[PDB]
Each structure stands twice: as C-alpha cells, then as structure tokens.
Design a binder for this molecule. Sequence first.
Ligand SMILES: Nc1ccn([C@@H]2O[C@H](COP(=O)(O)OP(=O)(O)OP(=O)(O)O)[C@@H](O)[C@H]2O)c(=O)n1
Ligand SMILES: Nc1ccn([C@@H]2O[C@H](COP(=O)(O)OP(=O)(O)OP(=O)(O)O)[C@@H](O)[C@H]2O)c(=O)n1
Ligand SMILES: Nc1ccn([C@@H]2O[C@H](COP(=O)(O)OP(=O)(O)OP(=O)(O)O)[C@@H](O)[C@H]2O)c(=O)n1
Ligand SMILES: Nc1ccn([C@@H]2O[C@H](COP(=O)(O)OP(=O)(O)OP(=O)(O)O)[C@@H](O)[C@H]2O)c(=O)n1
Ligand SMILES: Nc1ccn([C@@H]2O[C@H](COP(=O)(O)OP(=O)(O)OP(=O)(O)O)[C@@H](O)[C@H]2O)c(=O)n1
Ligand SMILES: Nc1ccn([C@@H]2O[C@H](COP(=O)(O)OP(=O)(O)OP(=O)(O)O)[C@@H](O)[C@H]2O)c(=O)n1
Ligand SMILES: [Mg+2]
Ligand SMILES: [Mg+2]
Ligand SMILES: [Mg+2]
Ligand SMILES: [Mg+2]
Ligand SMILES: [Mg+2]
Ligand SMILES: [Mg+2]
Lengths: 559, 559, 559, 186
Amino acid sequence: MKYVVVSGGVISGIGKGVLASSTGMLLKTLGLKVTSIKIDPYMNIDAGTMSPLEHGECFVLDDGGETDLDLGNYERYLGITLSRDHNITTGKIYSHVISRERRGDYLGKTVQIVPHLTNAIQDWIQRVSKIPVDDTGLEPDVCIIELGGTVGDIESAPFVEALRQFQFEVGRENFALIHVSLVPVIHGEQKTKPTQAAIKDLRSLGLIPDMIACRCSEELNRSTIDKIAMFCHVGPEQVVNVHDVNSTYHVPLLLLKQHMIDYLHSRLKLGEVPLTLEDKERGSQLLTNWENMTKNLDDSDDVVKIALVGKYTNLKDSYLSVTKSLEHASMKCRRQLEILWVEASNLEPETQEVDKNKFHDSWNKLSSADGILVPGGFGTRGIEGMILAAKWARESGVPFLGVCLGLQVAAIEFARNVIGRPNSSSTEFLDETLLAPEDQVVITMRLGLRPTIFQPNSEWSNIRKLYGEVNEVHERHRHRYEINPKIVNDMESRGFIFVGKDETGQRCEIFELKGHPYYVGTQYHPEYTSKVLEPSRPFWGLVAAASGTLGEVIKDINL
Amino acid sequence: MKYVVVSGGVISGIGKGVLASSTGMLLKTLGLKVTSIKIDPYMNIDAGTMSPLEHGECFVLDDGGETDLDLGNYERYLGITLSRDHNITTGKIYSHVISRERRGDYLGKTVQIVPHLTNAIQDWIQRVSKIPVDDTGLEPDVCIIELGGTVGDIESAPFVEALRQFQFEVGRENFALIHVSLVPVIHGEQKTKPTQAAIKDLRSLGLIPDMIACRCSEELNRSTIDKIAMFCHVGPEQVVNVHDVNSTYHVPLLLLKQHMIDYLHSRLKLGEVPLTLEDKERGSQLLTNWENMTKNLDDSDDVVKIALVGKYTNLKDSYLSVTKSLEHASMKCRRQLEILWVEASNLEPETQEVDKNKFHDSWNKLSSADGILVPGGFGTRGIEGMILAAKWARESGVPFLGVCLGLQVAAIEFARNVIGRPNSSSTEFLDETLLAPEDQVVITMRLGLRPTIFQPNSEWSNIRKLYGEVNEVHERHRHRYEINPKIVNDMESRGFIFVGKDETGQRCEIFELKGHPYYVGTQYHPEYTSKVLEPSRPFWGLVAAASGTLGEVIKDINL
Amino acid sequence: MKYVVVSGGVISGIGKGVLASSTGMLLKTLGLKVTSIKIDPYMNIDAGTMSPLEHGECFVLDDGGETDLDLGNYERYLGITLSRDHNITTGKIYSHVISRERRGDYLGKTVQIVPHLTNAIQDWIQRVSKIPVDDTGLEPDVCIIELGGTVGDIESAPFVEALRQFQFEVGRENFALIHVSLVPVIHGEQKTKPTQAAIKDLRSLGLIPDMIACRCSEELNRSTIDKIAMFCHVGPEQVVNVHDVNSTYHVPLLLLKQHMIDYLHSRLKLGEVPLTLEDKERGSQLLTNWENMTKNLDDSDDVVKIALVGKYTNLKDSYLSVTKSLEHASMKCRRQLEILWVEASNLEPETQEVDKNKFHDSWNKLSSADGILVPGGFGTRGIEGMILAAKWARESGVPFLGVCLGLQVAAIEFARNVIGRPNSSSTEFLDETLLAPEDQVVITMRLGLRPTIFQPNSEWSNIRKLYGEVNEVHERHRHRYEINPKIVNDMESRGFIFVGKDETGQRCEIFELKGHPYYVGTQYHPEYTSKVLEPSRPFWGLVAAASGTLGEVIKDINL
Amino acid sequence: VPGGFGTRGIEGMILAAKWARESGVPFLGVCLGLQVAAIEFARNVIGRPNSSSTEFLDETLLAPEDQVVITMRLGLRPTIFQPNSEWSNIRKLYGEVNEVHERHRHRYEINPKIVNDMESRGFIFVGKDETGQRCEIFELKGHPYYVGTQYHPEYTSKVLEPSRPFWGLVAAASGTLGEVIKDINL
Ligand SMILES: Nc1ccn([C@@H]2O[C@H](COP(=O)(O)OP(=O)(O)OP(=O)(O)O)[C@@H](O)[C@H]2O)c(=O)n1
Ligand SMILES: Nc1ccn([C@@H]2O[C@H](COP(=O)(O)OP(=O)(O)OP(=O)(O)O)[C@@H](O)[C@H]2O)c(=O)n1
Ligand SMILES: Nc1ccn([C@@H]2O[C@H](COP(=O)(O)OP(=O)(O)OP(=O)(O)O)[C@@H](O)[C@H]2O)c(=O)n1
Ligand SMILES: Nc1ccn([C@@H]2O[C@H](COP(=O)(O)OP(=O)(O)OP(=O)(O)O)[C@@H](O)[C@H]2O)c(=O)n1
Ligand SMILES: Nc1ccn([C@@H]2O[C@H](COP(=O)(O)OP(=O)(O)OP(=O)(O)O)[C@@H](O)[C@H]2O)c(=O)n1
Ligand SMILES: Nc1ccn([C@@H]2O[C@H](COP(=O)(O)OP(=O)(O)OP(=O)(O)O)[C@@H](O)[C@H]2O)c(=O)n1
Ligand SMILES: [Mg+2]
Ligand SMILES: [Mg+2]
Ligand SMILES: [Mg+2]
Ligand SMILES: [Mg+2]
Ligand SMILES: [Mg+2]
Ligand SMILES: [Mg+2]
C-alpha cells in the first residue's frame, strides 16, 4: 500500500480537488490500481440532508450514499467506483466513535480524542483504501487522500493529528504529502509569505511536506521558486505551479511537464509495486487517450449549443455532474461546447407580465439551442417552463434529453399536448386536489445503482443503439415519484414507447418518442456514471444529435 | 566535517552545558578530533565588561579573550584549547555585520537579517569549526554547537533560522540535533506536555530533533518514553534521561549506558571519518582513564578540607573554575573533597564588634581546614581577612596556595608580619596616600597565555617539582597590579624566593616560601588550564599537601 | 508484512520444525508480533481422521480444529494462539479450489493448477498471516512459513511454485528463505554433496536461498562452510549449524550466537517495522526469561520421576504435548525431569500369567515414581492398568493428575474402591451390557477452547490456588463420554469434590480429592495450552507436588 | 464498608462485618456494605452458612439468596422510615423526620423474603421505599452504632452539612454520639 495526501492551503477556496483528481490520474498512467478518499471537516453524516443551493448538487454512489461533490471528480477522472465510506467526515467519525462508546468497545476507558479517535481515523483510512474500486476485485496500489478544510484550523484538528501518527503507523516511503498553497500577486510582485505561514503551521501540526503546489495568478518566477525552496525544505524542482489552462482536463499534463510522476515514482519507490503488462500497457494506453482527447480539445472549433432548462441556474454547482457529462460528450463528438442557461420560470407566459426582457432572453436562448436538456431538477416551482421547453423540443424536432424530473415533465407535456388532458398534473406538486389524471405516483425513496431491462420490441430505439444493444443497463437512481404506470398503455399506443423498465416490469425507466431525431427520457440519473474517456450514453446521444452525425457515433460505439 | 547541535528547553535554566560537554567527551572516546562552539544570545561582545556577581566568573582564553563560563566546561572535559571566536554572541555577530555595512561589503544592497546575517552565522560556524584545538594543528572531525537561550525565543531567532539553513548548507548526515527538554513531576505523575510544546516549536522554527534529552527528577517511566516517542518522531531508544548522579563526571557514562555513542556513530556515519590507530587507541585509552577516575570517585572516602578564603562566597559561580580545579586535584589524590567557604571579611577583628557568630564560624572553618586557598579575588573590600588567613597559613604551617590576588596578599602579609613594615599596603587599594612601602604597582592590562621562566637556583622548590622541573611554564594571566619589584631583593634574602618570573626578568610570577610543607603564590591563574585528566600543577600540589603524600604525587608526575 | 519461509531438505526426517519454532522465537525477542503457518503436503483435510499411532498425537486448537503436531511447537515456543486455517494442506487447498469449481467462481474458465491454484495458495498465506494471534487483536509483523515435505518432490510441487510467485507478489526484502539441509559424515569426512544437490533443485524450482541450515552430526569445519558458500551463493557467516545441545530449548540461543537475528534484521529491514517500547521491552524481557530458564536447565540436578501410565508408550509422539508440558513444569520447579513410561496393561494381574518380568518392571517404575499421570489415552484396552495406578495413587498418597480419560478412570477407581460398586464400569467400553452402575455417559463430540467455572465452596482446592483463584478457566477440550452426573452427589459426599463444571452446571470438568497432598482430575486437556514460559497450571501442580515445595509454587503464582 | 464494585473482595468485607458486630466497633455499610451486612448476619447469626450474594453466586440457583436483581435504579429517591423506628440512632441523626431524600445506585437489593426473620432477630429495617417492598436502611438493636444504608450517603454531604450516617460513624468512633444528637435536634 502507498498514500499521497493532498492538503494545506492558506485559504479553503484554493482548489485542491483538481490536484487530487489529477495526481491520481497521473499515477493511473503508471498502470497502478489507484483509489481516493475525501476528508470533509463538516459535521454532516452524508450530503442527503443539505439542499443543492448550499454548496452544490446532491451526488449519488452505487450504495445509494448521497455524498460530497468531490467523490464525483475522482470517479470521473480515475474511472473508479466509490462507496459511501470513502467520504470521511467530522460527522461520521465522531458519530462512529461516540456510538461505539454506548456499545462499550473501549472497555470502559476514557475515550480521549487523542489516542482513541485519531486511532479510529487511522483504522478507517486503512480499511477504506483496501476496498476494491475497479472492474475486478483487486485491492488498490496507491490511495490519494484529499484533506478538506485547511491544515491550521479547528475542524481539521483530529485529522492533522491522525495523519501525523499515520506518517509512521504506515512507514515513510509509503506516505507523501502534497501541500497546496497561496502565492498572492500585489503591485506586480509574487508574495510567498502566506505560503511560508502555512509551512510553519504544517511542521508545527507535525506532517512534513513533499510538494508545494502554488495557486498563483501567473507562472512562478525562478527567484520565487528559489525562495519557497529556501523557506520550505523541498528542492526547487518540486515547487509545482498549477496555473489556469484552456480546460481542467489539461491539468494532469501540466503536472506531467512539471516532473510530478518522475518525482512520485522516486519518493514512493513505485518501481517496487508489482505490475503486470496488462496493468502497465493499460496505463500507457490511457495516457495516449488523455493526450488524444486534450489534443482534440486544442483544435475543436465547431460549436454545439445545448440548452440546460431548469431552476437555480445561477447556482451552476447545483448541476456540476450535468455540466461535466456534457463536456465528456462534447470532446467525444469533437464539437466545442456552449451550454445555454435557461432559468425555466422565465419561459412561462406570466413572466411577460413581470419582465418582458426575461421572457425574450430565455426563449431566445432556448430557440438558439442545437439541443435541449431537462436536467433532473429539485422542488417544483419552475415546472411550467420545463413543460414548455418539452413542447418546443417535441414539435420543433430539436434533440432532447429528460433526466429524472425531465422524463416526468416529458410525460406531463405529452399528456397535456398530445393525449389531450390539459388538467393532467405532477402528483409531485398538485397532490391534495385528488384529481384522476395523475401523471406520477409516490412509490418513500429509491437510491443507488439499479438494473434497467429493455422492453422486448426496443430494437429500433436510438437509446438502445447507444447502450450497445445490451439487454440490461446499470445506472444510478434517485426518485420518490415515478410515472403512473396506468397511463403507459396509452403512451405505448401514441408512439411514446417505454424502451426500458425495472426488473418487476411495473416501473418505467426509459422512453424514446417514435419518429423524432433524438427525444429521450431517462428516470435514472445518467450524469454520475460518465467518465472522462467514457461519456454517459444518453448524454453522448444528445451532444451527437445536436452536432449532427448521430449515426457515425452509433458506429463508433458498436464497432 | 560533522556537527552535533545541543539545543532546546522549555526553560533556560535546564542545564544543557553538561549534555554538550559530555556528548563531546563521548565522541572523543571514538578518537575523533572533537571541537565545540558556544552560542550566547546576550548582547555582550565578550564577558570582560560583566562583573563576577552577574552570572559567574570572568573566564580567560589563550588569546586573552575574557569569555563565557561555558567555554571552560568544554576545555576541561575535552582537553581542547579554545579561542575567543568559539563564543558566538548576539553582540558579536550583529557588531560584525553592522561594522561590515560601514565597510561596504554587501555592495550597497539591503542587509536584511534573513539571507545576509543568517549567512554570516553559517559562515562563522564553518570558519570556527576548522580552527585547530588539540596539541597539533589538525582540523576537527566533529563540532558540538551549544545553542544558548531556548529554541522558541526572540534572542534565539536568527540562530534557529541560521541553523535551519545550516541543516542543508551542510548536508544532513553531517548534522544532528539534540533537544534538551523539561518533563515536570506533579502529584507523582511525569508530565511530558512542556516537552511536546517545545517539539511543536522546534518543527515550526524548522530544525528536526534526533534526541530528546529529558531533565526529569526521576527515571523516565517506560510509558513516559513511549508517549514522548509518539509525539516526537524519535524512536524510544533515543529519549535519553539525564538525571542526577554522584558527581557530574559520571554523566558521560550514563549517556554511554543509554547507547548515545552507538546512536551518534550511526546517525552521523562516524565510521566513514578517517582515523589512525594513534587516534583510536588514544580514544579507547581515554575512555579507560574516565572509567578509572569515576571508579576512584565511587569508593574514595578519606576527606580533605580546603578553605577557600575570599569575598562573595555566596556566589559560588564567581569561582566555578577554582572549584572545578580542586575537584580534578581531589580525584587525582584519591581523597574526597570538602571546600570550606570562608567569607574573608568575617576573619577581620572588627567583625567581633558586629556579629561574634560570623567571627567564630569563619575562624572555625579556617582552623578546621587541611589546606588553604586565596582564590584570585576581585575588588579590594575583603583584603584584611585574606591577609589574616595568609598569616595563619605561614605561622601554623598549613598548606597554602595564593592565586593572582592571593600571591599579592601573601607579599603584603609577609611584609607586615616578617619584614616588619605594618604600614605596607596594596597599591591596588590605598593609592592616593602616596606612601613609600608599596607592595604592588600598576604595570593598563595583561591577559592570555604567557611564558613563565624559572629563576636559576629553583631546583629545591616543590612547585618546580610539580611542573616536572621543566624550565618554562605556559599558563593564563590576568593582572593590572603586580608585585613592586624593588622589594624582591629583601624577600629573596628572607626566604620568600621568587621561583618564577616573566622572560624580561622584571616581573614576578611564582614564589615558594623556604622551610614550609607547601606555601606557594602564583600570579597567573592556574585554574583555567586544568583538565579532568590533568589537574593544574599548583592545585594538585595543594590537594596533595593537604591529603599528605605530596612526595608520592611528585613521583607520579616525574616517572 | 514480512515472511520467512523454512524449507528444503535432502531428506524429510531432517527436523525443520525446531528451526521454524526457534527462528520465530528469535524474531519475537525483537518485540515483533510474530505468527507462523505450517504447510503439510499430505492429503488429509485435518488430523482428526488419523489415529495417534500414525505419526503422533491428535492436537486441538481453540476452534476445535484437530491438527498437525507442528502447530503445537509454534504455539508453545511463540506464546501464540493458532486457528485451523494456519495448517495449509494438499487436502485443504485442493478440496477448497475443487469445491470452488462446483460453486463456479472461476467464471467457467479452465482451473489449471498453475495460475489459479497457486494463486489460491498465495491468497491463503496472505489471508492467514493477517489473522491476529496474541492477547490483543493486532495483526502480525512477521510470518514464519514451515514448508512440509521437501523442495524437490511431487507432493511439494504446487507449494514451491506458489512460493516462487510469492517471492514477487510480496516484494523481496519482505520475504526470506531458510533452507535446512543434510551434510553426512562418512569415514570422518563432512560430505556437502547432498546439500549441493538440493541447492541445484531449489534454484531450479525457482526460490533463492538465504540461509543454509545444516543438520550435521558435528560442528561444521571452516573449510566445509567455505565450500558450501562457494556452491551455494550465501556468504560463509550465513551457513548456520543446528547441531544437538543439552535440550531443544537451547536451540534459539545457538542461532543467536550464530548471528541469525543480526542477519534477519538486515535481510528483511526489520528496523523499518513500527514498534512501541511496550513491544520492544517485552521483547528484550522475554529474551532474559529464555536466558534464565536455559541457565536454570544448565545446573538443575535434583531429579523428579513422573510415571506416565497408558497404552502405546513405545510411540512417545502419541503423547508429545504431555511430555512437553511436563518439561515446562520441570524447568519452572528447577527440578530435572525423568518420565517413567508405564505401559499400563502390564500393571494388570493377568500379565503375571504371560510374563512376570513385564508385571514387575511396570509396578517397579510406578512404585519408583515421585508423581503419577494418567495422560488422556485413546481406545479402552489398557484401562484396568490405569485403574490400578489410580488406586495406588489414592491409597499410597503419591501426587496424581488425570487428564481427560484420566479423570474418568479416577471416578471408576473411586466407585469400585471407595464407594464399593465393583461392577461399576466405563460406559465408554462395557456398553451393551446395559448395567445400572455407569460411571460415564455419551453426551456426539465436544471440541476446542471452552469455559470452566469453579463450583462455589472451592476455595480450599489446590487446583483453584494454581489457577490464581480466578472464577473461570479457559482450556481446550476433547471428549465424547463424560462422568455420569447422577453419581456426583455421592462423590461430593465422600470427599471427591467437583471443583469445576461447565456453565450449565450439568457437566463435570475438574475434581480434587479432599485430604491428599495433590490428587486432581481434569476432563479438558491441560497439555495444549502450556507455553515454554507459562506451564499449564495442573501440570505445574503435579511437578511441584512431586518435587516438594507445592506451597512455594502457590506463592510464585499468587504474588 | 464503602459501596464497592464487582464481587472479588466480598469475603473480606463479610469478615470485617463479623468483627464489627461481635467486637462492638462502630459500623457503616454503604450500598454493597448493607448487603454484606445482611449476608454476614445470615451466615453468622441466623445460621445459614451457604447463604450467598445473588450478585455473585447466581447460576448455582440455591434457596438461601440474600439478594435479588430488581435492570437499574438511580438518582435522588424517597426513603420512608418504618413505623416503630423511634429508638434508632440513624433516625435521631436524620432529625427524626419521617422521609429522607438521598442518591441511589443498585441493581441488586436485599431479598425481601428474609426481612421477617431479620426483623425478629433484632436486625430491624428502619427505612424502606414508598411501596414498602424494598429495604433501604437497617440498624442492629443493642450495638453502639451499626448501620446499613443501601443508598449512597456520600454524595449529598456538604462542607458545612456532613451526611447524617457518616456524621453518625465519625461521632460514634470519637465518642460523644449523644452530644452530636443534641447538636442536630436543637
Ligand atoms: N478537475 C476539476 C476539479 C475542480 N473543478 C471545478 O472546481 C470547483 C470547485 O473548486 P474545487 O477545485 O473543487 O475546490 P474548492 O471548491 O475551492 O474547495 P477546496 O479548496 O476546499 O478543496 C467546481 O466549480 C468544478 O467545476 C473542475 O472543473 N475540474
Ligand atoms: N520569515 C521571514 C521572512 C522575511 N523576514 C524579513 O521580513 C522582511 C520583509 O519580508 P519580505 O521581504 O516581504 O519577505 P517575503 O517572505 O517575500 O514576503 P512576501 O512574500 O509577502 O513578499 C524581509 O526583508 C526579511 O528581512 C522575516 O523577518 N521573517
Ligand atoms: N559538566 C558540568 C556542567 C555544568 N555544571 C554546573 O552547571 C552550572 C550551571 O548550569 P549549566 O548546566 O551550565 O546550565 P545553566 O546555567 O542552567 O544554563 P543553560 O541551561 O542556559 O545552558 C554550574 O553551577 C556548574 O557547576 C557542572 O558542574 N559540570
Ligand atoms: N497534544 C495533545 C495531547 C493531549 N491532548 C488531550 O488532552 C488530554 C489531557 O492531556 P494529558 O492527558 O495530560 O496529556 P499529556 O501530554 O500527558 O499531558 P501531561 O504530560 O501534562 O500529563 C488528553 O487525554 C488528550 O485527549 C490533546 O488534545 N492534545
Ligand atoms: N522445538 C522442538 C522441535 C522438535 N522437537 C522434536 O522433534 C520431533 C519430530 O521432528 P521435527 O523436528 O518436528 O521434524 P520431523 O518430524 O523430522 O519432520 P520434518 O523434517 O518433515 O519437518 C518430536 O519428536 C519433538 O519431540 C522438539 O522436541 N522440540
Ligand atoms: N558439483 C560438483 C562438485 C564436485 N565435482 C568434482 O567431483 C569430485 C569429487 O567430488 P568431491 O570431491 O567429493 O566434492 P564434494 O562436493 O565435497 O562431495 P562430498 O561433499 O560428498 O565430499 C571433485 O574433486 C570435483 O572435481 C563436480 O564435478 N561437480
Ligand atoms: Mg469560507
Ligand atoms: Mg473542493
Ligand atoms: Mg531567567
Ligand atoms: Mg549553561
Ligand atoms: Mg519417509
Ligand atoms: Mg516436523
């Protein structure tokens, strides 16, 4: 086993999550079975209690574990599947050892937070890094730990102590620390004193740093690096600069130009880890897929405009997984992406009574879009705008994907505007009216990776061509409310055909509309399973249809 | 070159100076040409300005450099000769670089204390550790640096930075840090939190510790060591305990039982230093001289009482070199020492008018003494008591040594009480009277190691037998005032014979009185040149005469 | 993790089991949490099917796993508790992977013995060496693997391949091979060609040796070692000699004189394993307990004669654990042991009709004994001799221990000879007679470590003093047949008091007879739990009573 | 006998209770102390030498059980004095007030089916729980001061108001137990 801990910061907004998700990617190019752990200093047990307004979207794992965003960034960069244990939190570990007290397992000793709770952290990291994460049950070679918060805090405090002991309870040369740090620029001069005042605290809290990964606004001066290597004890080759480049998928290749694999190969003796040619050649091939997709980003010019239609579009992190899946689908089509933020409530005609500028800008963005996405919203208060965009996408022939709530407004749209029931309703919203035309029903939660089976006649469905025509699809779910299955025999007659269903047959999970270029609902969330070299099939479908050449993508899949 | 820095402390009174003077002694048993450097955070250039009341005696070097006490402890433990450069001070290095500014040598740059002054420290330590110190001009193998003050101060601050750079400007494995530390005991429990709050500051200021040398009141518990080795990163074998033992000459052998040579041989790769058999066998022989003299201390019982007669005897550190030279002379005679502190002014008959108890206790201690010492006092205000003790020592036949002022009160005593001039006077005191019977004259200072030549007829003199009958003696001086040379032809006629003189003949430096068992004045200071295995010949004379067997010591010397 | 594999041999009778049980002991003196694995090339799943005539006694583990003898040697040398998984066998691993085939887990591939079965071995060794074995659930630092059979066989073949891959699937410097070997002596010359013809095969089968542990009849010549170090690639310091010495408890200290800890500390980098002072000081203290008990064996002279009374005494390995527990008890009493082999059937009066010499020699040995043991026999055909020895031990006051069957013949003896039922019988033997005076009943098996609770009045019982007066005893069991609990109220009235019982109260597990110096039955097996520094309390009782000073042992326990 | 925990020292605590009863020395049993006093009195005055702490010797299932489990009972609880109690030195120390409020801990309590025997033999249960079914104080008739309290009297003592059973013990041991009973009741 080996560990690399990514850590530090003068400030908590500094962006450690790319250097974690990008260090682990570079180590995966050596062919190593890499894994990752997030530490979050917040008290939440797991993210399911905190709304998407409050620091971004509610992620989903194979377990159903509603979790921190930063798990998702490692899953999509590293190709790995994570579990709800990979998110260490102050909530979890304190709830764990305090529940263990009432169980009695410390034999009625004191449960001081030094010794015993820092021992539970060091045990949890050693459990979790041995859980398998790739397509086979082989245990990881290297674990990337992202230490949330900063080193020099009061929510960080048990973790930085636990990791001082863990620098020895796992031997040095099986552990390395990467310290992210701030180097401000003021009046044209690079200021390395915030960094030198977090190297003092790092040595004090007891870890010793290996890298000094500065988030400067610039290239670091040769004299700036020379002084950071005088005040921190690292050699000047190790003072990596992580400055902005044309997209975040380039960041691994900047770190590779900055020798970071050659340093980590030495500093963790990675030549002593046992690897097969099936490991190593997969490693060096994955490097060439990353060099190819970044070269394709560097000279892709032909734009594709996708309208993302929903509430809270000013909080873009409320959709981080939706955005990132369109970026994967974009780079695979070799069309450059623009996403058009349509704040759905502005499409509703009553907006014309409040501000006409909003009514025109939103319908302008929607009309300009080469493809349309209803992105699995939350709450109900924007729903009429999401219905109008689904009417537009059906009648104007524009490519369409409905995710989760998106499948459900598509059924509501089709009921109101093709089946001809204008009172038909989201039972998710208009409940205590008790009306008969209910497009949905509550069936109290359903979460995690679940099996979707294709219905028998489905051969013609573009969505089934995009899934490689395989009879079952494994994808991640969230929904309380599902389509009322007593309308399905009507929709099945009117050309709205339910391509895919749950294994009991009673629950509807995919539809495709007959006789449209690409119009799909998926009631699972296709966002979360997308990887940077394997875009999620419904999202690859949307960005292909909107680019043209949907047929040529269907060959690239099925060959 | 190799360095061991002795450092640290929660508190500055903790006693680092033995662990320095005793680490260097253990390394000298490997045969290495060891040297030592004192750092003193005080602003004094050199100790000549600060009176013996204010933190102890005014030392003297071969240069005449009036210096910190702690040079003396290394000289006598290590056998080495030091120079006034071996005392780094905040006074010296700031006076040096600020005088260098007016000379211009920084080419008109800023002389920031980071970079440039910490570079002058790192240059000074590298100059000084290459100065020769043994009986031949061979440069040192290892240098012990004693960092005065504490690590975690404001007078320490440039030194701890300079030594962080010096951990690299000289490579690791040529440098090691020994951190002395406090482990209080309260209500019967050993408290290792003062130590853990100086390991935090040490890592912060940037040095990394190797040893954790606790000054506990006890043996450290196995659980106390195990926790210090959990919070400091040292292994538990390295947490040396430096507790009190029957005399400070045992301390090296406690550190040798605690593996400290075996650790330093590894941690500085001392097997790679080139040594001859003339080095190595001198090393292992010196170890057996230390094992022998400590075994002799362990079962020597026969006491010898020496009266030390002078002012300020409540400030025993005002005489630290005098005390230590009697301890060497004691252990060489194999008699256990008691020193009788005679506060000289109490011997004066006017004390009987003020407090009779003082007059009796002081004359009781003087009468009880097996030998008498006038210890080179300072000022003049106790002089009549020192004259009465010299009258007593001459008439009652008791063994006597006068050092510096001691030779001078012996001439004043002999003038008043044998030559018969009762008005004869210390010109050092009774100056503006302008009287003719002046026993002294001013000749403005005279300092350092100087040559004393024996006068021709001297063959019979016990002091010349103790110096091995060699024609010239090299010893360290301090005196403004010297014997008036126009009385010498009278004293030479009356049996007070000046055994030794300055090379010009005009200055008188040793006398021995004819027809007394042992009665000597030396106007140089014999204290400073004594080593733990080579006691200063006049002091070996005194403690031998007082023990009996002065003749048997004269064979041990001359064989 | 670290591994040392003990292996090799020109011949299979060469005695590898001491070098395994003695290498692991030397590593435990560094304080390392050592464990051990036995590989047995035989096809038996576990030893319960093979009778004690056929290669020695039927061992018992905490699991109830009836197992190979060689587990016992590591348990008693290393203080460890093992589990039935620590005995790898050709039976087990082939039964495992062939049962796994019918379960389907190789996904319908071929299950070649290369790749897949050698992968199951390498998985099993990596599972098993992480199971905890000491008094706390901490996973082992080093694992000793004893490779049964020889390297160069057809029953060895999958293991030597699995261990060639395991030399890499665990890195070199986490693995070392010790090759035991034969160096015959013929016409006075040491013959190192059998050894050189097993170093050829070792290199061929692909492991590389580290040690060459010769079982010569002599000290190896300096020229013999020099040639073995020319033909094997080891340096001559590594060619350890394992010749006979005054008892097998000396063998670790011969290997310690032959540098084997200093070599294994280097060759596995054991300084890089994390140890506490509670580990290290327990390590160096256990070394002094081994130096003390071997020094006590070197000058203990006062004999104690213990009669071991049972069938098959010509097959001494049928009692190996019984013998070894008396040796521990002996060395703890500081009396030298003689065991008197009484072939029990010879005590029966009908032997006088067959051979009087057998009848006299057996009663002579029994009468000569200072103490008597009925050693948990098997079958029934010697039982009348074991009853006569129990009559003798009760009436002649001689110290007595009955183990398992020994407790049961003691109840049968007491019934026939004190309660006065001469027809009372072992229901284990005389079954289909259906008589009413049944001293036993079948209750179909009961195995492994079980809880024995002391009955309330038990305070006076010497056996309860030997167990430290603790209310519950944890010890290993085997019995189909147990004392008929409907006789107990009679025996409890006649002074045969059942000191200890099963937690239900219904089963009787210890008795002590009132008013005899030491007369005990234990229906569990006290042999198996004895360690070389912690002799089994009933056996320490017997060898103490027979030595005299049973009271002084009761202080050594309870202080 | 200071309200111990576990059971492994209990025979020593019984011998000290035998000594304190027969040698007339002043005695206080707190919690477990009341319980070993009942066990002592059963073995050494009532004459059942097999009588036992059911807190220890449980799965023997014997009939002379001096205690029973009744799963926890904690905090400040009301103790009511039994009617005839006027003569009891412990009731004089509580100011003769009919109810006492003090802090409890006990899983195991005296088996209430022995009480009618002890009440006949001069071991009188001065105080009980409000249901009457649980026994909380005893005082032995005809001894200078010999008390069991099954609550813990330690915790309620203040530096200017010492806990009445403990003021009783240190007064009896000092002599002048009567003079303390005036200092209380005046
Ligand atoms: N490989 C990555 C990593 C991060 N991000 C972006 O980074 C964001 C949040 O910043 P991040 O780098 O994850 O760190 P912070 O949120 O600043 O938090 P912290 O510094 O506490 O880790 C999101 O907007 C996400 O789009 C990204 O696009 N690609
Ligand atoms: N740890 C430090 C670093 C610098 N200085 C002193 O502080 C002065 C001003 O600090 P500055 O020159 O700004 O040093 P930087 O570390 O570069 O600060 P910044 O990065 O903000 O420019 C320096 O000339 C130097 O003498 C100091 O006392 N302690
Ligand atoms: N080998 C030694 C070293 C020190 N001392 C004694 O130690 C004294 C002063 O304490 P020291 O150990 O030199 O250190 P501190 O004065 O406490 O100062 P610091 O801790 O700042 O180094 C003197 O009284 C001297 O007699 C001694 O006798 N022998
Ligand atoms: N660096 C540390 C050390 C200890 N503790 C906590 O503080 C409590 C009280 O400290 P203490 O137990 O006294 O630890 P020591 O370091 O031994 O303090 P001392 O040496 O003074 O006894 C401990 O139980 C532990 O939970 C802490 O928060 N931070
Ligand atoms: N520490 C040890 C090890 C072994 N033996 C003795 O060794 C025996 C059997 O030989 P062993 O050394 O265990 O090995 P072998 O039986 O020869 O088998 P192999 O060589 O196949 O391992 C038993 O008689 C046992 O008494 C012993 O007394 N003490
Ligand atoms: N691997 C070897 C070893 C030896 N020889 C030759 O065989 C001769 C006889 O073998 P021997 O001298 O007996 O060598 P040893 O290995 O010592 O045989 P042994 O140990 O049985 O004495 C040697 O002189 C040598 O020339 C050989 O051919 N191949
Ligand atoms: Mg903030
Ligand atoms: Mg982040
Ligand atoms: Mg001070
Ligand atoms: Mg000092
Ligand atoms: Mg055979
Ligand atoms: Mg064997």
